[PDB]
Design a protein around this ligand. Structure first.
Ligand SMILES: CC(C)CCC[C@@H](C)[C@H]1CC[C@H]2[C@@H]3CC=C4C[C@@H](O)CC[C@]4(C)[C@H]3CC[C@]12C
Ligand SMILES: CC(C)CCC[C@@H](C)[C@H]1CC[C@H]2[C@@H]3CC=C4C[C@@H](O)CC[C@]4(C)[C@H]3CC[C@]12C
Lengths: 491, 166, 95
């Protein structure tokens, strides 16, 4: 337990701070064995370090997403599991809990190691080591084969599952690639297909709520109609407080997520802001103030903009929304920065002059800024004004601004958008799948007032026989595949 | 087109007030359908196939998003701007048309001073402009660029199949 | 003619519901022959199932647009056509 052997930034190398783990992490498959059949003092394989990490945790921590390290880690993992099968059969190494409460599979999911995670998720053995397997192959009638994937600690029915870890805890740059792989793919599709009605029912409820909102906002002043208007006002108040309570419950039970991933949700914040604005405006009408309508119409805009949340649910439109987000985040902010710098400079320049007579255009900063911004929308005036003493200087400055901002910068923005769209055309699908996974995990729960009944995923099957008693049965997920390649290699 | 033409012709004997609309609609539809024979030459047939692919692939979802944005902002502008300190943004149709004028490069973006909430109107209009005209239409251009780059090889086979059907 | 051996969506594998077609569809070019010179009871090659499908129809059903399945289907089709040339010359299987 020294500063060099712990996990930090700088000069460090974490290997489990254990001689057995040290030997395992260095591809030394000659001494790792010798630590296990030495007659004097045998080395325990379920021994943990000060961090609550066993040898398997040490192996998964040192895993990088490289072809040469992944193979090493995978081979050592498999060999050590088979070795521990013959030494400690009564205990299972895959279910050794960390100090943080994680297992090697969960630790791989959280740390973002995708190669070892994929290998562990689907691993199959040939002979005596059938129990130490996750993916099983049942009857191969002709070229169709049914694969049973183990759903232990990965089905969302458990408290801390692998699906939740990836969704809400993984800090990896590309964690949308870990959500689309085998037995993490089909399961999510089945869950989404089963949860579609609830999703579209929520969409219909929100649409009705905003129809009521629009009707109330459009038909308000500066009887039966008055009674209906009051009913609409109170209905909007309760709807806004309901949305606010839901968002607050979300942020209460997911307090960390705002730091793991701001960019991935970014609609919960918008819903919270809209609900806050709505409730604040409704409680601000009892004050008979003057700043009621601005906030009311701001919430009205924000809700209709947030209606694009349910645009997700269809691939064609969900991928479009993802691409819209990527374009906004990638090549729109810097263009805005340059544009505002240019606009401010030229507007201040035009305001400084053009007050020397030979109303008045370019009277102030706001007026000149608006006149210059009119050029962007194809509405700028470019006349040769003759009342000014410096008409030529004004015309030359305006021409310089036009050629420097409208001919160059906006067309370059178009080109940047084109290259950005061409660049992110493949990851958007995975991002959409991750968004669907998050939505499904949210819909599996109920609401802040009623918790939904939880549903087991996967069937109970006939897996095999354990080496301690008799039946060792587990919940599995069944998937058929028509594969001719595997069927060729079994004759 | 044939149904509209025959229905309009059998509607002139009734002296119906809705004859000319259907007549001119059939007149538009026939001249548009004249592009059926555009196929028959490779250069123009492949262009027609690409036009169809572009319409079907990256124009409908843009229309959905655009109409959502336009309706939201139009309703917002109609809700206010009726508090005096004709009248612009009098109704839903008027505000919708005024907002759609921005797309064709003809939108008015003045600082109207008769209204009590001129700043809120200007900020809302600027938000709409930057959110719909700078971003969405250029992204549409990019989407058509990538779609044209994507379907540049299957369009020839589609044109050959169209010729086979003809 | 069982639910698993018909063409539907889900748990299914259609091979022509005939032993000869079953052997042909499984790249078993050792037993397909033996069904054709068994002296006791020969197996007809122009025999059709309940769906009106013969062995070639079963072969073209199981054909996917894959490089490894297309080769199998093509080779079995050609070999079985040549085999039927020597058995039934008066009747043509392609029609
Ligand atoms: C947050 C409060 C102050 C409102 C200001 C932010 C709003 C108005 C702006 C800022 C970022 C914008 C969003 C950026 C991303 C998306 C996702 C896309 O699929 C639809 C448009 C949408 C939803 C935009 C709508 C308008 C938007 C939400
Ligand atoms: C169907 C009635 C109601 C008219 C409305 C549809 C018409 C007006 C619209 C909808 C889809 C459009 C067509 C979409 C595809 C093509 C093929 C292309 O090579 C020429 C343009 C053309 C022909 C478009 C012409 C206008 C069009 C036909």
């Amino acid at each position: 337990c020294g500063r060099f052997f712990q996990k930090h930034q700088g000069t460090c190398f974490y290997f489990g701070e254990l001689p057995l783990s040290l030997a395992a992490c260095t591809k030394q498959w000659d001494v790792v064995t010798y630590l296990l059949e030495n007659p004097h003092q045998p080395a325990s394989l379920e021994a943990t370090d000060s961090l609550g990490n066993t040898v398997l945790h040490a192996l998964v921590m040192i895993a990088d997403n490289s072809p040469e390290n992944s193979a090493l880690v995978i081979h050592m993992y498999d060999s050590l599991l088979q070795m521990g099968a013959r030494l400690c059969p009564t205990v299972q190494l895959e279910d050794i809990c960390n100090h943080q409460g994680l297992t090697p599979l969960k630790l791989a999911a959280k740390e973002g190691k995708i190669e070892i995670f994929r290998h562990i998720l689907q691993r199959e053995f040939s002979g005596l080591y059938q129990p130490l397997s996750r993916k099983f192959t049942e009857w191969c009638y002709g070229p169709v084969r049914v694969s049973l994937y183990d759903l232990s600690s990965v089905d969302s029915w458990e408290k801390n599952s692998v699906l939740e870890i990836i969704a809400f805890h993984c800090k990896s740059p590309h964690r949308h690639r870990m959500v689309v792989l085998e037995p993490l793919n089909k399961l999510l599709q089945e869950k989404w297909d089963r949860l579609i009605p609830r999703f579209f029912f929520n969409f219909a409820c929100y649409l009705v709520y905003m129809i009521i909102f629009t009707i109330v906002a459009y038909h308000q002043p500066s009887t039966f109609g008055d009674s209906m208007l009051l009913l609409g006002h109170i209905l909007i108040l309760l709807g806004g407080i309901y949305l606010l309570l839901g968002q607050l419950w979300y942020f209460w039970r997911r307090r960390l997520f705002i730091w793991i991933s701001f960019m991935d949700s970014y609609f919960e914040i918008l819903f919270l802001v809209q609900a806050l604005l709505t409730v604040l405006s409704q409680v601000l009408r009892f004050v008979e103030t003057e700043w009621y309508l601005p906030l009311l119409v701001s919430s009205l805009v924000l809700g209709w903009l947030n209606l694009l949340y349910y645009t997700r649910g269809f691939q064609h439109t969900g991928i479009y929304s993802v691409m819209i987000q990527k374009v906004i985040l990638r090549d729109l902010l810097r263009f805005l920065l340059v544009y505002l710098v240019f606009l401010f400079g030229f507007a201040v320049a035009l305001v400084s002059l053009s007050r020397e007579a030979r109303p008045v255009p370019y009277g102030g900063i706001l007026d000149a800024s608006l006149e210059l911004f009119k050029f962007t929308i194809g509405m700028g005036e470019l006349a040769f004004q003759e009342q000014l003493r410096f008409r030529g200087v004004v015309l030359l400055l305006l021409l310089a601004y036009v050629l420097l901002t409208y001919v160059l910068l906006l067309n370059m923005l178009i080109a940047l958008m084109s290259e950005t769209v061409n660049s992110v055309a493949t990851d958007s699908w995975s991002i959409w799948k991750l968004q669907k996974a998050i939505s499904v995990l949210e819909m599996e729960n109920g609401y802040w007032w009623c918790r939904r009944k939880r549903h087991r995923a996967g069937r109970l099957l006939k897996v095999g026989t354990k080496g301690d008693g008799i039946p060792d049965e587990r919940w599995c997920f069944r998937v058929e595949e028509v594969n001719w390649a595997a069927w060729e290699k079994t004759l």
